[PDB]
Amino acid sequence: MAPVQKQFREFHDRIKLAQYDENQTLRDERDAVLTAVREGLKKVFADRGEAAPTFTPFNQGSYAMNTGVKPLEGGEYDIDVGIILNIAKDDHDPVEVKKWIRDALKDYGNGAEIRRSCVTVFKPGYHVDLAVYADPELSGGTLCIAKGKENSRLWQISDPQGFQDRIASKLSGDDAAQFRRCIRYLKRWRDFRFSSDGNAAPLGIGLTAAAYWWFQVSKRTDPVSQNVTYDDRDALEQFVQTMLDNFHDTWDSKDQRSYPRLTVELPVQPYNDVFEKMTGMQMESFKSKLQALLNALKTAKSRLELHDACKALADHFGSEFPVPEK
Numbered sequence: 001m002a003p004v005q006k007q008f009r010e011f012h013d014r015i016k017l018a019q020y021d022e023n024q025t026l027r028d029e030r031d032a033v034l035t036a037v038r039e040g041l042k043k044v045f046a047d048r049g050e051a052a053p054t055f056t057p058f059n060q061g062s063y064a065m066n067t068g069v070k071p072l073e074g075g076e077y078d079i080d081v082g083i084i085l086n087i088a089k090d091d092h093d094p095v096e097v098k099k100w101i102r103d104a105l106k107d108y109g110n111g112a113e114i115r116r117s118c119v120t121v122f123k124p125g126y127h128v129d130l131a132v133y134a135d136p137e138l139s140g141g142t143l144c145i146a147k148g149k150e151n152s153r154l155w156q157i158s159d160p161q162g163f164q165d166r167i168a169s170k171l172s173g174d175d176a177a178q179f180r181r182c183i184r185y186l187k188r189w190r191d192f193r194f195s196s197d198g199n200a201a202p203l204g205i206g207l208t209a210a211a212y213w214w215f216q217v218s219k220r221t222d223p224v225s226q227n228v229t230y231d232d233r234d235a236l237e238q239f240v241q242t243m244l245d246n247f248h249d250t251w252d253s254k255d256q257r258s259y260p261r262l263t264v265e266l267p268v269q270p271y272n273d274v275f276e277k278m279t280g281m282q283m284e285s286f287k288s289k290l291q292a293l294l295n296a297l298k299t300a301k302s303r304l305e306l307h308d309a310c311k312a313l314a315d316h317f318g319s320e321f322p323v324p325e326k
């Protein structure tokens with residue numbers, strides 16, 4: 001077993017959050033927001049003179065892909081759900097349709113809010129982000145998400161279940177488990193070292209897509225027993241170095257200088273750069289902290305003392321990274 005593998009697996013155990021199918025609590029919080037939309041829509045459509053539209057819900061995001069992490073103390077769960085309304089996208093404005101859902105949830109928890117890509121409702125210790133889609137069968141065979149706010153706004157081609165399939169299918173078995181561990185590690189790093197400025201933080205979706213493009217398994221197969229051991233430290237070092245290698249200096253005509261930018265395309269529609277909202281200064285800070293993480297992964301490998309190796313990693317992963325006593 002590689003040095004520090006035991007402590008990576010212990011760290012993983014402490015940061016992992018059980019996915020929808022293994023987590024009764026998340027399923028119940030999800031279903032309650034779903035019920036409140038159904039109840040809420042009757043009331044919105046009472047002023048319309050016809051039944052509220054039917055919708056089909058589906059799991060989205062980290063809790064659907066088994067890449068979920070516990071928030072830091074006083075952080076929030078992010079429950080992602082898709083609802084496909086039984087409507088023709090050409091019959092309705094996307095902000096109009098998001099309004100139905102916001103107004104539906106006006107009286108649920110602390111409030112409801114139309115965002116660029118979802119309706120978000122707030123409750124004690126978590127939010128539910130509802131992605132709102134039109135019916136493909138009524139919309140010319142495309143699944144489209146309702147994009148835009150009052151301050152803008154279209155039906156954008158979307159493929160959340162294709163993205164979910166891509167993450168599930170890249171690898172299998174214990175290879176796929178390492179891939180998922182390494183996404184979770186970077187999400188905890190994100191939470192620990194980008195707490196000062198939430199806005200500057202790389203999105204979980206961006207770390208996940210980066211892993212889809214660039215993650216490689218690190219394992220060894222004993223030449224005697226063929227017993228297999230994983231090396232998460234090494235897989236992370238190769239992955240972080242590959243991400244660093246894909247930053248490009250990008251000219252900014254306003255500032256008259258370049259900023260390093262990492263472009264990470266979603267591998268399904270709409271194939272957008274998931275990091276496009278990050279500013280050049282945020283990208284420079286992202287790159288510098290990634291390089292500092294890479295340097296710690298390399299220092300960990302060479303330390304005489306397991307204590308010193310684990311301390312070097314704890315400095316980037318936070319208080320759940322085990323540090324054995326010297």
Ligand SMILES: O=c1ccn([C@@H]2O[C@H](COP(=O)(O)OP(=O)(O)OP(=O)(O)O)[C@@H](O)[C@H]2O)c(=O)[nH]1
Pocket residue numbers: 060061062063067068069078080129159160163164187203204205208266274
């Ligand atoms: O830029 C984006 C963001 C989100 N999405 C779609 O919405 C889903 C929810 O996007 P989230 O931003 O909630 O990401 P996540 O759940 O995968 O990551 P963490 O919260 O664990 O940090 C994503 O998993 C993807 O399907 C996009 O297609 N593009």
Ligand SMILES: O=c1ccn([C@@H]2O[C@H](COP(=O)(O)OP(=O)(O)OP(=O)(O)O)[C@@H](O)[C@H]2O)c(=O)[nH]1
Pocket residue numbers: 060061080115116117118129130131145158
């Ligand atoms: O394709 C997408 C994009 C986003 N989403 C879902 O929408 C959530 C919010 O994504 P938004 O795109 O609505 O955030 P925003 O730009 O409004 O952010 P601020 O104005 O507050 O800075 C994401 O976390 C994800 O759950 C999807 O489900 N699919």
